[PDB]
Amino acid sequence: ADAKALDELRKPKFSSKYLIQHVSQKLIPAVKEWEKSYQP
Amino acid sequence: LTTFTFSGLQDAPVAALSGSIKLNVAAKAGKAEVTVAAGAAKAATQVSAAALRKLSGSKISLAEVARISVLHSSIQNYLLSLSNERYQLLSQWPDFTTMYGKDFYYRAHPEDLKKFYDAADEYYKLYETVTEFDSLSALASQVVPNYAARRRSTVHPAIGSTVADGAFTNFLLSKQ
Amino acid sequence: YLAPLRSDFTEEITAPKVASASNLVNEWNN
Amino acid sequence: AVSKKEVLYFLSSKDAESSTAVKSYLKSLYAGAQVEATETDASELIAQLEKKYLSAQVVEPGVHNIALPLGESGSAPVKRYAAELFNLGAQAGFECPFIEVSKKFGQETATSETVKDVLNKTKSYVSADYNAALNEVLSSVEAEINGPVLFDGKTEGFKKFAAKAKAVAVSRGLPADTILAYCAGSANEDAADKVSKEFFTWFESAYTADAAAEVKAIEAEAASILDRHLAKPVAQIRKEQASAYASLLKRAETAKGAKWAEKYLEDVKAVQWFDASVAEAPASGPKVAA
Amino acid sequence: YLAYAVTKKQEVQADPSNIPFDEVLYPQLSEELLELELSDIREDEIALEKA
Amino acid sequence: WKKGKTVSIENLNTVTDKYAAALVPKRKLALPVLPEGVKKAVEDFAASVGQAKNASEVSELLAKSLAEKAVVTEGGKVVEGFSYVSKAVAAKVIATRRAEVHE
Amino acid sequence: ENDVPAILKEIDSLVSREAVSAKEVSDAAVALTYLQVKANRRLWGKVLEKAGAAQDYDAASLTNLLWAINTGGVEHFKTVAELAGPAVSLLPSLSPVQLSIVVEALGGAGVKNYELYNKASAVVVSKIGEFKPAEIARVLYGVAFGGVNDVALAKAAGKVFASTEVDSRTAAQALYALAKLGRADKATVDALLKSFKKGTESASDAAAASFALGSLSFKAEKAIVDALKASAGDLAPAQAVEAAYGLALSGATDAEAFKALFGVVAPAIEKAPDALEVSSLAQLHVASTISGAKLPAAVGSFVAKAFGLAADAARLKRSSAESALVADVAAATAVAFGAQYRPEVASAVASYVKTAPDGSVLDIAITKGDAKVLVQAVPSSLLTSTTPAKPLGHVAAYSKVREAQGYAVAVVPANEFEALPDQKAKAQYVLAAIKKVAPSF
What we know:
Number of strands of chain A: 0
Oligomer: part of a larger assembly
Order of helices and strands of chain A: H
Shape of chain D: extended
PDB class: proton transport
Order of helices and strands of chain D: HHHHHHHHHHHH
Organism of A: Polytomella sp. Pringsheim 198.80
Number of domains of chain A: 1
Number of helices of chain D: 12
Strand content of chain A: under 5%
Number of strands of chain D: 0
Distance between the termini of chain A: 60 Å
Largest sheet of chain A: none
Chain A: ATP synthase subunit alpha
Largest sheet of chain D: none
Keywords: mitochondrial ATP synthase dimer flexible coupling cryoEM, proton transport
Largest interface: B-D, 61 and 86 residues
Entry title: CryoEM structure of Polytomella F-ATP synthase, Primary rotary state 1, monomer-masked refinement
Radius of gyration of chain A: 18 Å
Distance between the termini of chain D: 27 Å
Number of helices of chain A: 1
């Protein structure tokens, strides 16, 4: 209810950080399957 | 701060500089009796030379509790300070309601009274939107995302032209 | 008060595009 | 949870939501959990792509924690703002901006034999006001040789170009003799001390002028956004903003199960806590647990 | 702020001495708004004296 | 409102006093309300002589006798010799003049 | 008539009004350190809110404020780093005792202001007799921790520390400043180690000279370490770690000094294991290894993982000229162990990147049966900043922890390695360094 914390209240709110994480969770595991399967 | 600090009871402030609070220390050999007087209250305790050195052992590390973020609240504080400079020139608007009487209605040209009543309706349009301060928080979110993408630089968050120009002459005017 | 979330990087190192002074102080002084 | 390569990146980080993911990870390792073995894999192109996307998860909450010095007088708010972004570079795994942009030059031009191809592959990182002043001087030294000026250094045709480009670099205002004498060094530590004090006098006047040019563009963007908004009637403003707020909520409610949309709507509930905690005690502010 | 504004507006609007009387404020206007309506009758009375 | 400062309610209220001080007309009739301090001291004098049942009627005539010769005050001071023709007198001049031209 | 919480409420109402000047915010901060008000963080926050808002600043109130920020242990980078604006404006106006307080406070907070420390060192190297030796160590602590490698000051400071004998608190600040600069000039350190025989009234400077010696690897001087075994209750758990880490790096074997130091940090990790940095949990595992003094069973196993964490984090955030050096040393390690052609060195350096037992990754780790050899490259950031350029004490920290894991760490420093002209000379330098440590290879 009232009186959250300090370390809960120090977070910047509408930063990205989780689009950057969601992209890197779908780009890094999708590009390791590109260099393991690569011949020109 | 660092891990070890080296200040306390040596070249310390011995007295307050304002009148709102009165400070006196009793510089003894080992300890010191402080005399603090603020308003109606007085405190008189004793602090050692090794009692101030343990003070900076645990750090306070203050941090800001912002509504959205510290970045956004700094943009919104600037929009609030910009919206003051516009409000201060609506403070200098002439009191048109002193000419609302019917001895100004009937002496005046009928088209210069339409314009006068339109210039009074215009001031209430300007004044009711410069005091819409609840709209300044959504205006700060139109500045944030383009700024934040310039800080997601692939080189550095703090890179700029003057550094990257001056670091080109180190790259170009050296050998290859 | 909330913004669109963007996840894209800046590759160029450019000048930050200072915008032009709007005439609102001159319009409201008029 | 974190993927154990994020948590190695969040150790020297100092934002809140990354330290509480570290602190609950270190509390798991106190209760006898095994630290998982970090990957000795992920070849040179994938390693530079994980470093690109893990530094940007340290930079993104850190940029939102740095107050812009908008509408301030003096250099020290602009020097504080620049120093907080320097420290955000070091926390996210970047080096000095001098050492990180010159690495960008030598990587984009690893295959350059002529300096005209240097001046076209380092185009994105050098100012076009400075890229043009190095292209006009290039075509004069191209006129004296009538052969492409080489990126060799041993060539005398480059040595007359590098003495003409040094005349350009001092014309912009940047001491090309001081910059070169820093990244080359000297033998004794006393004569290298005076050139480092003269490089860092340029460097601090350099990165202040990039931070101050960034502040003067946010000040100019916000002043044109406001003056466009102050010209609206107040009924238009409230529904232009309620349309933009509701469309942006619905984009986070369309996205189900995503971590970003779950955290987006959880921060909307934390803004509404902030507005409600202030309403209970407005001379006190928000109530923190103490 | 609004609570003082509804008791300052009513403190002025409940006083009956604050009712604006146009004949007290502008005496020459209400004596000319009368002679607009009396001159419209006088033009009907001249038309019947001519008849 | 100053630059980084706040607005005080003892300044928002003296601004609202300047708005409601323009709602008063700059020349007005001093229309008297009979206060409770006088309308009960008259009803006291009427109830002591046993007219407590028609005691409301005695007060109203004292209210109306001040109201009918209510004087015109410009700036708090009384403008002397100021005669005005009301809107109900002037609409009686019109109604008799209409009836003597219609006849 | 003696009221501490009723005088906090009258300081709270002094800084919560609308136009607090510089002198009233300075003296409210001075009153909060003498009263030792670490428990109330919001009252310290209301002072630093008005400390940034205050626009007047004379020479007296700026130094009383910055003393109170540094002594009180209160950290806010935005407020303190914008107090360097008054400081460069009041810099000729400052007394030499006042200039030592602002640079020790702005330097110790990490304020990156090169214009401040350039002009504030120029008044110390011009007016050096004007400065007391305690005021030279304060400026030296400031310019070092503000990121300026000003050795024109570090030489002029050493001329004073050999001419005047200094206080124990003065010397340990000067050692801590030279340890971050990484200088290790024995002509100046030994002039400061003779100040630690009159006894030390603080444990925080005996612990800081302990850290500053081991970071330069000099040795423990027998009156610092026995000053540390009696007063290891005065130290915070982040400060007792850097005492034990600094004794272990200097070669101290007084295990009851390590019983005293580990008697602070072990119940602190048992209460909250996330209280310390992971850089400090790794500095405990170095100290719990080289002296060999044990920890509790829940603690010493926990800080063993946090050496594996804090060594990976410095490998992911590698300086990219250290990445250029490790892949150069590993190539010469492939040539030294027999690889004449490029498909053999490229397939060998990929085999040198075995996993350490704690979970971390070793870059050049060679295994022949029952013997392991680790090759360590230590570039320039881990070298001493002076002309002989030995590696700093942290390289023997990393070596002796890996040596207790079954490795034979061969140190390859880059001041010697990259002075070599070709790959064959670089391979025989690496091969000789492996023979010196484990001659089985």
